[PDB]
Amino acid sequence: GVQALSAWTNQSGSTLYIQSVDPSGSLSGYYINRAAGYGCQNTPYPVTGWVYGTAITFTVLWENATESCNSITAWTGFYYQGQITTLWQLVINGSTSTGQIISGEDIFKPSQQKKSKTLK
Amino acid sequence: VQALSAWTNQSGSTLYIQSVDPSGSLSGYYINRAAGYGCQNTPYPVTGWVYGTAITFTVLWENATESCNSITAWTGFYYQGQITTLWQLVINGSTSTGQIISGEDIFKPSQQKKSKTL
Amino acid sequence: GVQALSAWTNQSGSTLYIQSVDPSGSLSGYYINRAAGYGCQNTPYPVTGWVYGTAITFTVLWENATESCNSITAWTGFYYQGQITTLWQLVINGSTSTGQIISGEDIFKPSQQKKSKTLKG
Amino acid sequence: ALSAWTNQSGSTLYIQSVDPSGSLSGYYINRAAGYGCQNTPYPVTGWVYGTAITFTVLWENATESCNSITAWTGFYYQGQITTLWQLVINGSTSTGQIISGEDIFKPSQQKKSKTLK
Amino acid sequence: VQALSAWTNQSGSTLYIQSVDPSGSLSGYYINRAAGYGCQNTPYPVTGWVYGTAITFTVLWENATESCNSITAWTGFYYQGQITTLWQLVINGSTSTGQIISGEDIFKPSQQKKSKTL
Amino acid sequence: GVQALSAWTNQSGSTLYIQSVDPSGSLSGYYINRAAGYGCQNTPYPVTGWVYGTAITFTVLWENATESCNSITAWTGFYYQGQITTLWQLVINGSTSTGQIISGEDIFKPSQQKKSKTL
């Protein structure tokens, strides 16, 4: 069951930061995109989602203070063998056909927290 | 796709959009009426995003009367009076992307019955 | 007694679905009215309120995008002897007098939660 | 949006937000003589639907709990909110323990300073 | 520093911490009672962060009864059962750091009081 | 000036990403620290605060799943002449003296949001 203060990096080096998970299962966090061929790289995008045991969904709105890519991604997946294995779907604002929804597979590995006693 | 809208799919399942925030954040609930899926006829919570005509929304299949140990995410777009969606359903305890169920839902808007009193 | 993911059905067949109770006591859930003659039947309405031990309040906005009945109900009650005993107050939009506010008593009995291992079955 | 409502006792309802769903959020200061939980802030939730309103206060905060909850039901009419309220105590056994009455709330005009000084 | 903890400073002002999330997110209210200040004896909203003994919280001096057109931010720490803080107060329309007001507040905890009834 | 979806970068290359400002003035966003000689660099941290015309406070909790620096910063400042001018205070968990609270001045300048039509 994926927990609050967790971070998950995919094969493209994109990271999901889970900042909270309610007892209700409601997930909150942010996402840095580092995938080649995708705009909206390097800056934080908001995340909402659900956790139910090892099942997870999470979706990112591709709009923030620095860059907007006029789109939304939803990942559906499961926690298994220390990684989140997901199928994702990307929809573009102004789409008119299902063929324009891009599909793919992301697998996320957990990062371990580097702890400093001070900002320095 | 604004606050206080409802959308019914080819199976007669309804998404109730309670609010859409300025930030795009979606809040609401969902009634499944699709044959061959459990968790029918009672409301499940929805979160998601709206960005113009693009929408994602996802349902946690646990409520006060029935839990089905799963989550559905819908990805799609509003166009020509309908939300065209692709959905993925994941079961708690899954070990393979082959256990994730996929389909397409077409959501048509409900027209409101307005009464002056309860 | 009153907790997250408990369902409560009154003498008329209406159901409060308590989804969540925060550590703060904040209640979120859903209401389906099934009360004979009343409008806005068999369609879910949002709920907010408070739980404090056996004390509960919860209020339903009778507006969703399918059916709207131009009103708000507030229930005030307590859990005791395996039931929630409530007094409710229903206000209609456009009211001009306290005399137009409708009141009654709802007794809510618990329903147990059904567990399935999948949505497929 | 941001608004303040004061009743016959000088109890003040502070509405901090109203969603487009009509969901109400804010806080409340009780000044009613005889109740405890006076003159400190308590959390508020409710609904607004046209001229109809409900709002309810949990009587627990960092300094004082009174082990109870109040729910107000009413309507906007001639620049005021006319309400019926019901108050339930935790541990109650009977509807006879549910205290009910009426409150009228007038809008509080916002006193603008340009400094905390 | 926890949910439903009350803190009163040398000037009689109280911090009412309503909630602290597992994340460290702080919500609550503030009543100012300090001589020489506007916006006294009505509740203002508080946000901030707790991280072990480290705390920040900040008050917008606007509610629908009295606004003072300013914001305070406290930075401090829980030490020997008290919170020691340095505060900065900024007024709307400021053009110099010299117009920001600074001081020190030491906040003492008050045990939460329990009445049987209301 | 200070609004939903405005980004603000200080003299050290640290960016405040304001995601939303409610009607009430409640600020929600993200921060990426890029300042030479600090921990918790190049990873986003959560922001809460208040906006009241040109007055702003915001505070960053130096904890995420990749890196924690056991501390919190609060910025107090005002938008003026295209810039947010701020004084900041940095408190480390387990401090025992106000002497241990570090301070400085940050000047944040805004970027124009870029619109890419495709991701």
Side-chain angles (χ1 to χ4, degrees):
Chain A
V2 161
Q3 298 293 73
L5 274 157
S6 62
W8 306 88
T9 302
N10 71 14
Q11 73 280 358
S12 298
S14 301
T15 306
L16 164 71
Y17 307 80
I18 296 172
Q19 208 66 20
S20 68
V21 182
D22 296 354
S24 79
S26 189
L27 170 153
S28 306
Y30 41 90
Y31 192 95
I32 291 189
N33 176 39
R34 301 192 197 82
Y38 293 99
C40 289
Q41 294 175 350
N42 297 316
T43 69
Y45 293 84
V47 177
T48 189
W50 294 117
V51 182
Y52 196 164
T54 66
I56 175 161
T57 65
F58 64 84
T59 175
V60 168
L61 177 76
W62 294 111
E63 196 182 43
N64 70 12
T66 74
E67 193 178 1
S68 70
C69 294
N70 210 37
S71 65
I72 320 167
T73 300
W75 293 257
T76 302
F78 57 85
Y79 180 55
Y80 178 61
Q81 286 169 353
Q83 62 177 216
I84 311 167
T85 304
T86 70
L87 298 189
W88 60 259
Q89 296 186 305
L90 166 55
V91 60
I92 305 162
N93 171 29
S95 281
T96 59
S97 62
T98 75
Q100 286 177 280
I101 300 174
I102 309 176
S103 290
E105 182 163 338
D106 278 354
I107 306 179
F108 302 80
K109 107 269 231 296
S111 314
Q112 190 58 56
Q113 199 181 215
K114 160 55 182 309
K115 278 219 237 148
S116 327
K117 171 163 266 52
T118 186
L119 207 64
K120 266 208 223 293
Chain B
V1 180
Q2 68 271 88
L4 266 40
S5 59
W7 305 81
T8 304
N9 68 21
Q10 68 277 7
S11 289
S13 302
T14 305
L15 165 66
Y16 301 83
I17 303 181
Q18 213 195 308
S19 60
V20 187
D21 293 348
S23 58
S25 179
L26 182 151
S27 205
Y29 50 89
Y30 193 99
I31 301 267
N32 177 48
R33 312 197 176 86
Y37 296 96
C39 287
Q40 308 190 116
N41 300 317
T42 66
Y44 289 83
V46 172
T47 190
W49 293 123
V50 183
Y51 197 158
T53 64
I55 183 164
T56 63
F57 67 97
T58 173
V59 168
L60 182 86
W61 297 107
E62 170 157 59
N63 78 11
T65 69
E66 196 182 348
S67 79
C68 296
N69 204 41
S70 49
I71 313 168
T72 309
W74 286 259
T75 304
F77 57 90
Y78 171 81
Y79 199 60
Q80 290 158 165
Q82 94 191 4
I83 310 182
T84 311
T85 62
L86 301 182
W87 57 261
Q88 303 180 313
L89 157 50
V90 59
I91 306 160
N92 180 19
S94 284
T95 65
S96 176
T97 49
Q99 289 159 345
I100 299 168
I101 304 156
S102 304
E104 168 176 343
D105 281 355
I106 299 166
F107 283 91
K108 289 152 159 190
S110 299
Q111 204 135 45
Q112 200 174 113
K113 313 163 181 74
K114 299 159 202 170
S115 326
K116 303 188 63 204
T117 79
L118 198 70
Chain C
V2 187
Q3 57 200 125
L5 308 171
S6 59
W8 306 82
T9 303
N10 67 15
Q11 65 282 349
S12 319
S14 299
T15 299
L16 168 68
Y17 306 87
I18 307 185
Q19 187 63 203
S20 53
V21 187
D22 278 15
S24 71
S26 186
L27 179 156
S28 308
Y30 319 97
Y31 198 93
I32 300 176
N33 170 47
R34 312 201 181 76
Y38 285 88
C40 286
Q41 286 192 56
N42 306 295
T43 188
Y45 292 103
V47 185
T48 187
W50 293 116
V51 182
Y52 194 169
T54 70
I56 178 167
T57 68
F58 63 94
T59 174
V60 170
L61 178 79
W62 295 110
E63 183 164 34
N64 70 26
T66 60
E67 299 196 38
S68 78
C69 292
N70 203 38
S71 53
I72 314 171
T73 302
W75 291 260
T76 297
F78 55 88
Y79 181 75
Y80 191 61
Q81 289 164 143
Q83 57 174 243
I84 310 178
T85 306
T86 67
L87 302 182
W88 53 264
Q89 292 175 334
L90 159 51
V91 60
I92 306 152
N93 176 22
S95 297
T96 58
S97 167
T98 57
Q100 302 172 319
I101 293 167
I102 298 149
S103 57
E105 178 170 350
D106 276 358
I107 303 191
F108 293 88
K109 304 232 171 163
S111 331
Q112 287 167 249
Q113 188 197 56
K114 180 172 185 187
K115 322 284 285 146
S116 326
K117 212 218 290 162
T118 173
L119 185 71
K120 184 206 140 60
Chain D
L2 220 92
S3 90
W5 292 89
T6 305
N7 68 12
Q8 68 273 14
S9 318
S11 298
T12 296
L13 173 64
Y14 293 91
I15 298 167
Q16 271 236 282
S17 49
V18 188
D19 273 22
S21 68
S23 170
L24 188 154
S25 192
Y27 51 95
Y28 192 97
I29 302 293
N30 177 51
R31 304 201 174 89
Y35 311 92
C37 285
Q38 70 265 46
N39 305 304
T40 64
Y42 290 87
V44 173
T45 191
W47 296 113
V48 184
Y49 194 167
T51 77
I53 184 176
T54 62
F55 72 84
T56 180
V57 172
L58 170 74
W59 297 111
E60 170 150 61
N61 73 2
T63 55
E64 206 182 354
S65 52
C66 295
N67 209 30
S68 52
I69 316 168
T70 307
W72 287 255
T73 297
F75 55 88
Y76 294 91
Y77 170 90
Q78 312 185 139
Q80 113 246 308
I81 308 176
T82 297
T83 66
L84 310 187
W85 55 257
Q86 303 195 297
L87 155 69
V88 56
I89 304 155
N90 178 23
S92 284
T93 60
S94 167
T95 53
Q97 293 182 289
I98 300 177
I99 309 173
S100 53
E102 308 181 55
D103 280 350
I104 321 297
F105 289 83
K106 299 292 147 190
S108 281
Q109 187 198 119
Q110 185 176 9
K111 169 181 155 86
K112 318 295 295 275
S113 215
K114 266 166 288 142
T115 326
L116 220 69
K117 307 128 57 191
Chain E
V1 179
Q2 46 177 121
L4 295 173
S5 58
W7 308 83
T8 303
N9 65 16
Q10 69 296 324
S11 293
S13 300
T14 307
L15 173 66
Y16 304 86
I17 301 176
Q18 197 64 204
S19 54
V20 176
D21 300 348
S23 82
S25 184
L26 180 157
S27 278
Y29 323 108
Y30 196 93
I31 291 174
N32 174 48
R33 303 195 184 83
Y37 291 97
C39 286
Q40 297 196 38
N41 311 309
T42 72
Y44 293 89
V46 182
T47 188
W49 293 123
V50 188
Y51 191 177
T53 66
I55 178 182
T56 66
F57 62 98
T58 168
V59 165
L60 188 73
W61 299 105
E62 176 170 34
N63 65 40
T65 69
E66 190 177 350
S67 64
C68 301
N69 196 47
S70 57
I71 318 173
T72 301
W74 291 253
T75 299
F77 56 83
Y78 177 102
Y79 175 31
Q80 306 160 135
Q82 302 180 295
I83 299 168
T84 300
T85 71
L86 294 183
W87 53 264
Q88 304 189 305
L89 172 293
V90 56
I91 311 158
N92 180 19
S94 285
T95 63
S96 177
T97 62
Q99 306 174 299
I100 293 166
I101 302 175
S102 294
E104 180 164 343
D105 273 356
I106 297 183
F107 279 95
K108 281 189 184 256
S110 164
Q111 229 227 321
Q112 191 206 222
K113 278 91 190 197
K114 323 296 292 306
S115 336
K116 311 197 290 291
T117 167
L118 189 93
Chain F
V2 193
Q3 69 175 33
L5 304 170
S6 52
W8 309 83
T9 302
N10 68 15
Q11 67 284 345
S12 327
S14 303
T15 304
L16 171 59
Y17 305 83
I18 305 179
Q19 191 61 208
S20 60
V21 179
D22 313 340
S24 69
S26 182
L27 178 152
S28 293
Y30 317 109
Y31 192 97
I32 303 177
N33 174 36
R34 302 192 191 86
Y38 290 74
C40 292
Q41 299 190 27
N42 302 313
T43 181
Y45 294 94
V47 178
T48 191
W50 294 117
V51 186
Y52 200 157
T54 65
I56 175 170
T57 53
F58 65 86
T59 179
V60 168
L61 166 92
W62 296 107
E63 183 175 56
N64 75 25
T66 68
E67 197 185 345
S68 63
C69 297
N70 201 42
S71 45
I72 323 162
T73 304
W75 291 256
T76 300
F78 58 73
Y79 173 85
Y80 173 63
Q81 265 176 332
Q83 265 185 355
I84 310 165
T85 306
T86 64
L87 308 174
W88 54 265
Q89 297 187 299
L90 164 61
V91 63
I92 302 161
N93 169 28
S95 291
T96 67
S97 165
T98 60
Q100 298 173 323
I101 296 178
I102 307 174
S103 59
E105 183 181 276
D106 278 352
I107 291 193
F108 298 88
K109 305 162 174 288
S111 52
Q112 298 257 150
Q113 186 202 51
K114 174 163 63 275
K115 297 160 180 292
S116 333
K117 37 156 184 129
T118 287
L119 191 78

